[PDB]
Amino acid sequence: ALYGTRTHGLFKRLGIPGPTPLPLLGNVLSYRQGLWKFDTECYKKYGKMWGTYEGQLPVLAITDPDVIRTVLVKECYSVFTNRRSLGPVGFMKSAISLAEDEEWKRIRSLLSPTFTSGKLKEMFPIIAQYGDVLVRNLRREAEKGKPVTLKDIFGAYSMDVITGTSFGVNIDSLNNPQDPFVESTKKFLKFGFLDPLFLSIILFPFLTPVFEALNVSLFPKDTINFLSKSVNRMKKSDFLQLMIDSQKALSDLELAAQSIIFIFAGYETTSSVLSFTLYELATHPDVQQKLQKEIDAVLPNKAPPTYDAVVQMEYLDMVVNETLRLFPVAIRLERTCKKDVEINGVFIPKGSMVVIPTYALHHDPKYWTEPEEFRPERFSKKKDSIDPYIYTPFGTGPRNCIGMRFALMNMKLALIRVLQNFSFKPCKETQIPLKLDTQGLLQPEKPIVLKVDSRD
Ligand code: HEM
Ligand SMILES: CCCCCCCCCCCCOCCOCCOCCOCCOCCOCCOCCOCCOCCO
Ligand SMILES: Clc1ccccc1C(c1ccccc1)(c1ccccc1)n1ccnc1
Ligand SMILES: Clc1ccccc1C(c1ccccc1)(c1ccccc1)n1ccnc1
Ligand SMILES: Clc1ccccc1C(c1ccccc1)(c1ccccc1)n1ccnc1
């Protein structure tokens, strides 16, 4: 059984500290507390650089901004181009989040004109039309005299926007739970929990070819089929339309992968940050009232938002940027060495992983005074510019979040509407302080519920 004790002497030899890996498992057992908790604990114990093992895969965490800049920007195309080892994914191998090396550079180049600020300005009325249904669905829950579970309200809004901006179909997620789009896309929420299949190829990466050969995918095969068949039937009759017009050619299999992955990526994360932003505005009433004072001063008498009004709301941008500091839903940034590389005078083998602990650097007292406190004033345009390698909620470099500007616009349009019409405050069922759960996509331990009062 030559598999278990092959690489577990690397960091010990290189002089890089870290937790003691168990045979076969590595340090994988330490993840059960959540990657956010494991990363902060390692940061406090070892410092600038530590080393863990996902099975037999060596993982080197780095916290020096000069080193982060080299891995995310300088040597991106040359060493650290790909994110994590390929797993059994089927045709989703052409998804932009999975594509590697030259194939990723090509797919990223084709999709880049779709997510420019110019195309976002053209789609602004499309995104904004989903604010009405959000305010309406939130109005009835407010007049019921009962608390509002934010994940159901903004989860439905996030699915509505991401599907409407992808296919042009105006789903009413909250009022049509039995819709096939809603039930299929709902299964994406299981992402973030324990995945034995994903963990099996982590500990035994040689199983990835076997699973592919047996047509086993890390994605919900039923949901991937519904979306792929839905994408095809629509092409006979938008993110989809922008990708059809672009047809270096984007194949039919590749385009179906990008449509699916954009829905997968935008659904829960947008829903999660939107709930975190409202929790902070409720537990900080003066922060909420000041933000309401800004929206009303720019948009008088509940005026419909325009692009220029949304972009020129500074205090709205500060609140969102601070919610993302406290809760970067993608806890960390990961990269793979496509060759033997020397990082900060340390020789790292090919295929090893480099983790930028975003969450740990976001709560570091060395960079943020009172790091556990929601202070939007950190992102005031008068202070010194925040380090782009310490604050990395969307990552940095050629391979950062391609939908960063879209997600920020999608959330702000929602925040402006709900604040134009409602105020938010806690109640007996609200957890203070907020306890994060162990899920790999940041979620609270108990669902956020807030009292929603209309301003009229
Ligand atoms: C506020 C919500 C969001 C957060 C916090 C977020 C966060 C991230 C992060 C941290 C990465 C990794 C970047 C890196 O490795 O440096 C990423 C990648 C990505 N995100 Fe997002 N994201 C969000 C919303 C979205 C939305 C709405 C979309 C879809 C339009 C999206 C699509 C992607 C894709 C496709 C990638 C992979 C980029 C690539 O590998 O080329 N994300 N996101
Ligand atoms: C032929 C060879 C086959 C090889 C099979 C390999 C199987 C590997 C199994 C080892 C698992 C090791 O687990 C440690 C790593 O876990 C880290 C991530 O998990 C953190 C959260 O869960 C902690 C896991 O350990 C405690 C058990 O808790 C499980 C809770 O799962 C989430 C609960 O939610 C219910 C399930 O999800 C539905 C969500 O709607
Ligand atoms: Cl599909 C995949 C293959 C290899 C590594 C990571 C992923 C990942 C995923 C998605 C669904 C189920 C299991 C793994 C993944 C899992 C955790 C963190 C990042 C990526 N993925 C999501 C988008 N593109 C790839
Ligand atoms: Cl276990 C693991 C290792 C490396 C990357 C991601 C994961 C992940 C996870 C989830 C919750 C707490 C710790 C790690 C994970 C993180 C984000 C999204 C999906 C899975 N996981 C893989 C299989 N089961 C769980
Ligand atoms: Cl892009 C993507 C698609 C499908 C599932 C997950 C993700 C991803 C993510 C988010 C939170 C926790 C783990 C992975 C992700 C996939 C791959 C690499 C980084 C992040 N993501 C959603 C939005 N922006 C990025």
Curated annotation (Swiss-Prot):
Its cofactor is heme. GO terms for molecular function: estrogen 16-alpha-hydroxylase activity; estrogen 2-hydroxylase activity; heme binding; iron ion binding; monooxygenase activity; oxidoreductase activity; oxygen binding; retinoic acid 4-hydroxylase activity. Its EC number is 1.14.14.1. It is found in: Endoplasmic reticulum membrane; Microsome membrane. Changing T358N: In allele CYP3A5*2. Chimeric transcripts, characterized by CYP3A43 exon 1 joined at canonical splice sites to distinct sets of CYP3A5 exons, have been detected. All are possibly produced by trans-splicing. The chimeric transcripts exist in 2 different combinations: CYP3A43 exon 1 joined in frame to CYP3A5 exon 11-13 and CYP3A43 exon 1 joined in frame to CYP3A5 exon 12-13. All chimeric transcripts are expressed at very low levels in the liver. This is Cytochrome P450 3A5.
